[PDB]
């Protein structure tokens, strides 16, 4: 996001965001704690204390049920476009 | 409820019943059970895995159970599940195939509805004409002239496929075949009479005699087989 902000307008594509966008949980041990922090950083840059900039993000996932509620919130993923099977 | 359900009676994506196969894997790790049909009788040769020195010998037989006055069965697999089937086998009793079909209907029922695990027991049935049957946890039964279930069943069937002379077999020849097949199947190079369990079914005087050979009789067969095998060594 630092390098995306060095541009007047930018597009970031997050293909297969379910790799890091999984929902936070506590399984006793530190299960997926590190990856959750990466997701927490991505959430912070999208909508945090600082303005994001002219970045318009775009994420694709075939497992949207696994994404964290904070990432699936407007202001981070405002539009939820569903690619259902064609009619 | 749905969370803890293992769904035993469902179809695998390839069309198989996993619990049935996993049950059949249990028989493969169980004791070797032999069965050979002859013209004047049929025998059940069973490997004994309760061969601990401190195990008391009180029962008539360990794996071979008498169903009725005409039939006997030997089980391979989970012994506790075998006791359930042997009791129900007795309650059903009768022609030999009718008894086998009736129990296999019970066994097939546990693989279709009820949600319970299947009976992990394979049975070899002998009875009076003379006939030998094999059953599987899937509920599939088949008549045989010579068959084996349990450990190294495939190896035992392989030597039966080669050494079983169809039609021209008596009890003495079949009993000799039982020791020879069991020798290669069991890892023991001697095959003492305490690790083998032989029972013969024969018609005497118009009455069926189901008898479990005493340890003295079996040692003669193990002895006679070893000299006969030693005789083949003289050729080479």
């Amino acid at each position: 996001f630092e390098m995306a902000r060095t541009k007047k307008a930018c597009l970031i594509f997050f293909d297969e965001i379910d790799a890091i966008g999984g929902a936070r949980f506590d399984d006793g041990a530190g299960g997926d704690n590190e990856v959750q922090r990466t997701m927490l950083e991505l959430i912070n840059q999208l909508d945090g204390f600082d303005p994001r900039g002219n970045i318009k993000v775009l994420m694709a996932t075939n497992r949207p049920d696994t994404l964290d509620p904070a990432l699936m919130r407007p202001g981070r993923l405002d539009r939820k476009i569903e690619f259902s099977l064609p009619d | 409820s749905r969370r803890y359900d293992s769904r035993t009676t469902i179809f695998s994506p390839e069309g198989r019943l996993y619990q049935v196969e996993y049950a059949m894997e249990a028989i493969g790790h169980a004791g070797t059970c032999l069965g050979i049909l002859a013209n004047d009788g049929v025998l059940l040769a069973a490997e004994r895995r309760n061969i601990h020195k401190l195990l008391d010998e009180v029962f008539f037989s360990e794996k071979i159970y008498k169903l009725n006055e005409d039939m006997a069965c030997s089980v391979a697999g989970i012994t506790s599940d075998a006791n359930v089937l042997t009791n129900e086998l007795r309650l059903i009793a009768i022609p030999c195939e009718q008894l086998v079909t009736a129990l296999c209907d019970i066994k097939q029922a546990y693989t279709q509805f009820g949600g319970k695990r299947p009976f992990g027991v394979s049975l070899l049935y002998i009875g009076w004409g003379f006939q030998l049957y094999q059953s599987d946890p899937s509920g599939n039964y088949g008549g045989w002239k010579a068959t084996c279930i349990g450990n190294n069943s495939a190896a035992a069937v392989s030597m039966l496929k080669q050494d079983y002379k169809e039609g021209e077999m008596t009890l003495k020849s079949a009993l000799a075949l039982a020791i020879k097949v069991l020798n290669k199947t069991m890892d023991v190079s001697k095959l003492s009479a305490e690790k083998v369990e032989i029972a013969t079914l024969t018609r005497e005087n118009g009455k069926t005699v189901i008898r479990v050979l005493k340890q003295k009789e079996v040692e003669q067969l193990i002895k006679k087989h070893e000299e006969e095998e030693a005789k083949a060594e003289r050729e080479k």
Partner: protein
């Protein structure tokens, strides 16, 4: 209740839940059974974690009939369920035949109950092994009923913690000509190797079966047997 079996076959053809039930047996207090020429002895380690427990309140060696007795190694509460079932099964045998139930018959009837919980819906197997001792037809009887429902006829066996070593101890210390009193001595010796601390008349329970029937030795009697050890 749940109508699906909680015990299922693993891909390796093993009833994994049954094996885990046997793991609970291996964690129970040691139980030793010896079938001598003139009787059977049942002994166990009835050791409490504090003196506040009343030792005589609950007994681990419990009679089933006038001639059959039980000792377990595993889960205490599950043993009482099997004790009640064994007594009920022994009675159901008695009303119909008007004869005391044979030892081999009760084990088969009890082991059938244990097998049910390995196949029935929504229940786990009993986490105990039952050592059944009895006297029928003038001959002593000793049986072991595993959680799976398999029953084995033992001349001498040990269950519970350190049962593998106790079994080998019996191989080198048991003979078929042994008498009942020497069986008690051998039984206490078998417990002693796995025992930690000192064996008093209250921290072990000994039960014997002979022609007079099955009775649980009082702590006073066990003291006399214990004195011969040292």
């Amino acid at each position: 209740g749940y109508s699906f079996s909680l015990t299922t076959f693993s891909p390796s053809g093993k009833l994994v839940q049954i094996e885990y039930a046997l793991a609970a047996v291996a964690g129970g207090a040691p139980s030793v059974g010896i079938k001598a020429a003139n009787g059977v002895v049942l002994a166990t380690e009835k050791k409490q974690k504090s003196i506040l427990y009343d030792e005589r309140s609950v007994h681990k060696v419990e009679p089933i009939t006038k001639h059959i007795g039980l000792v377990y190694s595993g889960m205490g509460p599950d043993y009482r369920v099997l004790v009640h079932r064994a007594r009920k099964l022994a009675q159901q045998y008695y009303l119909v035949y008007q004869e005391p139930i044979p030892t081999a018959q009760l084990v088969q009837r009890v082991a059938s109950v244990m097998q049910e919980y390995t196949q029935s819906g929504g229940v786990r197997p009993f986490g105990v092994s039952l050592l059944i001792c009895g006297w029928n037809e003038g001959r002593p009887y000793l049986f072991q009923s595993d959680p799976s429902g398999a029953y084995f006829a033992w001349k001498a066996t040990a269950m519970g913690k350190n049962y593998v070593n106790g079994k080998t101890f019996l191989e080198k210390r048991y003979n078929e000509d042994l008498e009942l009193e020497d069986a008690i001595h051998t039984a206490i010796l078998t417990l002693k190797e796995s025992f930690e601390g000192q064996m008093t008349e209250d921290n072990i329970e000994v039960g014997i079966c002979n022609e007079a029937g099955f009775r649980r030795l009082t702590p006073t009697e066990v003291k006399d047997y214990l004195a011969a050890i040292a």
